[PDB]
Structures are given as structure tokens and as C-alpha cells.
Amino acid sequence: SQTVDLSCLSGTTVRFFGPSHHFGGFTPLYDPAPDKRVATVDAGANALFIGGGGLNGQFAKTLLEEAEKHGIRLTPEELSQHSQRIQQSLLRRAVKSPGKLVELDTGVASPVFARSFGFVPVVPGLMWEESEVGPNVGVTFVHILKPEVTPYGNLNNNVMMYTVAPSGAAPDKTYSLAYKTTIAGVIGAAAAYNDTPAGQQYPVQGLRLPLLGGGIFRRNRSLESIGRANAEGTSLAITRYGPNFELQYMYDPSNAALHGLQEAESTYLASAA
Ligand SMILES: [Br-]
Ligand SMILES: [Br-]
Ligand SMILES: [Br-]
Ligand SMILES: [Br-]
Ligand SMILES: [Br-]
Ligand SMILES: [Br-]
Ligand SMILES: [Br-]
Ligand SMILES: [Br-]
Ligand SMILES: [Br-]
Ligand SMILES: [Br-]
Ligand SMILES: [Br-]
Ligand code: NA
Ligand code: NA
Ligand code: NA
Numbered sequence: 001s002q003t004v005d006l007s008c009l010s011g012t013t014v015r016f017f018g019p020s021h022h023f024g025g026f027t028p029l030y031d032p033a034p035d036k037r038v039a040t041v042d043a044g045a046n047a048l049f050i051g052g053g054g055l056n057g058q059f060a061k062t063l064l065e066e067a068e069k070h071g072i073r074l075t076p077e078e079l080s081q082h083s084q085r086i087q088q089s090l091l092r093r094a095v096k097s098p099g100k101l102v103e104l105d106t107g108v109a110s111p112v113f114a115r116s117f118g119f120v121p122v123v124p125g126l127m128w129e130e131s132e133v134g135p136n137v138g139v140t141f142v143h144i145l146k147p148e149v150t151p152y153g154n155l156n157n158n159v160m161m162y163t164v165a166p167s168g169a170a171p172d173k174t175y176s177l178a179y180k181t182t183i184a185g186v187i188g189a190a191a192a193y194n195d196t197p198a199g200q201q202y203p204v205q206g207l208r209l210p211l212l213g214g215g216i217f218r219r220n221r222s223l224e225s226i227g228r229a230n231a232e233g234t235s236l237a238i239t240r241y242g243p244n245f246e247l248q249y250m251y252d253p254s255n256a257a258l259h260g261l262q263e264a265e266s267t268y269l270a271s272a273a
Contacts, residue, residue, distance in 0.1 A: 001248075006261060008231070008268035009238050013246040015206075016258050020251060027250035029062050029160075029208070030151035038206035038248065039142070039159040041186060043215055046135045046164055048087035051080035054215045059160065063112055063149050070148040074111050086110065087162065090118030091139050098123050101142075101192035112149045114158075115198050117142040119189035121181050124164075133166035133178045134217075140164075140182075140189040144202060159193075159204055161186065165213035168221030175221070176229055182212060183233030184240060191241040206246040211257045227260030235264060 003015040019025030029040045043055045051060045060076055067074040086104065093102045104116040120139050124130065128137070141162040151157040163186050166178035190207060193199045214226050234247070249257045 003246075006265055008235055008261070008264045009247075010242070012238055012243075014261065015246060015248040017249060017251040019253075025251050025253070026058075027208070029058060030154075030157040032152050032154075034154060034156040036205040037156040037159060037203060038208050038246075039161050039190065039204045040208040041140075041210065041212070042160060042162040043210050043212055043217070044087075044141075044162045044164050046137075048084050048091065048136065048139075048162075048164070049080040050083035050162070051076055055210055059162075062151060063145075066149040066151060067111065072111055072148055079112065082110065082112070086113060086116055087118070087139075087141050090116060090141055091120070091136060094118035094120045094139060095123055101189060101196070103196075110146070112146060113143045114146045115144040117189065117193055117196070119185055119192065121185045121188060127181075128166075128170075128174045128178050132170040132174055134164075136164045137166045137178050138164065138181045138185050140185040142189050142193045142204075144198060155202070158202060161189065161207070163212060165217055168213060168218035168226065172225070175225075176232070179213065179226070179229035180233035180236055183230065184237045186212075187234070187237035187241050187243055190245065191243045194244070204245055206248055208248045208250060209257075210250050211252055214252070214256060223254045223256035224259070227256035227258075228263065229260075230257050231260035231264040234261075 001015050001017045005011050005013050017027045020027050042059045090104055098120050101117050101119050118141050124136050124138055143160050145158045165182050166175055190204050194203050
């Protein structure tokens, strides 16, 4: 990988991953010997389950494999239904206190989650058409994982996030608004989490991100337009919340997130001329 500080993100450290040793080069969600706590952001489904294909399926696999090692009986179907129930409940609570981090009651049982939070920057569907961007867009969840499903048994791998990105089929104007809102929810939820009691003990020191909306959600939208939305949304979210953590972009052979940030960086260099 290559790591640089971006002036257009107020000096935030960004790590751009190259191809991994794995088939297809995909970046692992969690590392075997991390020296800081990097929360990886699931490109979630509108229906809020952990499962299915792509990156969301890789999160399911990671959690299911750790559970199996610990002798926890947890099927993919149980994980899908459970994570959906938890996150539906968090979404309901978050919509009732929009723009605030909300926490699920600690009395709720979970085989995977020790503590769970939700955040909507604005009520989904209030400022855009759900028929265009899709349901539940902009919600981000933060989960502290139970030790028994924490990758490598390493405490620095005990936080995941889960975010619902807009559909690429939406018109440009509303897509840009929904996308910027979504990135605000990602950075804002993590920054807010770091101001909770749980976050004092387990601070998030980096985010590991895909290009959100860049998989099956993009439909016929160009990766270029999505990289531009990500660069603008990330710049704005960092201006709002001033997070201390670094950003990492998982390997993408299109380099779409990278290209969006490169364009914004050069523009920033020229902003006084
Ligand atoms: Br690797
Ligand atoms: Br490592
Ligand atoms: Br849905
Ligand atoms: Br399933
Ligand atoms: Br709102
Ligand atoms: Br909605
Ligand atoms: Br917002
Ligand atoms: Br807390
Ligand atoms: Br996607
Ligand atoms: Br944009
Ligand atoms: Br922070
Ligand atoms: Na759905
Ligand atoms: Na599945
Ligand atoms: Na996504």
C-alpha cells in the first residue's frame, strides 16, 4: 500500500491498499497483528442483514469463521436474521433521535455483538426519494464485537461498522446529496462513538473503507462519479467532525476512490491561485 496525508482532507492520513496476496487481491477486513484499532465499514444491504454477497458476505464469513473456531453454534441464516433484527431496532431508535448516536439496550442478547450503536444524519427518505436512492440510505451502525467473534482474538479488531449507501440509478443531484449524507454518517458515527464511554476504552483509530455504493448498488453509474462524490463527502465530513483517525481504502482495481481524492487534492492546491 501507499500512505499519504491529504491537504484536501485537512491533513488526514490515507492508506491506499494495493492488491493483497488473496485471490482477486481483495484487502482483508482485519489484520493478524494490528498495532491500532481499525474499524472496517461493511457496504450494507438496504434490509440491514449481514450476509449475502460481496463485501457484506465477507463480513458474514469472517464472523461465522471466528464463531466456529470458538464452538459457537451460529449459522449464516441465524447471523443474517439476528444482525437484521438488531440493526432494524437501531434504525428505529436512530430515526427517533435523528443526528444523534443511539445505543441499543445492553440487555439485548447477541452471539456476535457486545455493544451496538446507530446513527442517521437525517431521516432516510425525508430529503430524497426512497424510490430513487433506495430504502434506509445514510444509516451507519457501529458494533463492538464479542471476544469470541473478534478476528485473531486481537482487541484492535473488535469494532465493525455497517453503512447503507445510495443506489447509483438515482439522478445526479439527489445521488450527490444522499452520498455526502452517507459519508457524514460514517465519519460522524465513528467520531461520536469515540466520545462515548465504550469508545474511551476501545477508541477507533482508523477506518477501513470500500468505495461505498461501488458494488452491486452502483447499477449503471460510473465509478468516476462515485469517486467524486466520495471525495467531496469525505472532505465535508472531516470539516464537520475533525476525526483523529486515519482512513484506509481497500483495494479496487478501478482506483476510483483514489482518483476522486487525487482530483480534489490538486484542486485544493490551486484554490488560492
Ligand atoms: Br495480504
Ligand atoms: Br498485521
Ligand atoms: Br429494505
Ligand atoms: Br443466509
Ligand atoms: Br432529519
Ligand atoms: Br427510506
Ligand atoms: Br448530513
Ligand atoms: Br457506551
Ligand atoms: Br455496493
Ligand atoms: Br458530488
Ligand atoms: Br475521533
Ligand atoms: Na430491501
Ligand atoms: Na447469506
Ligand atoms: Na455500498
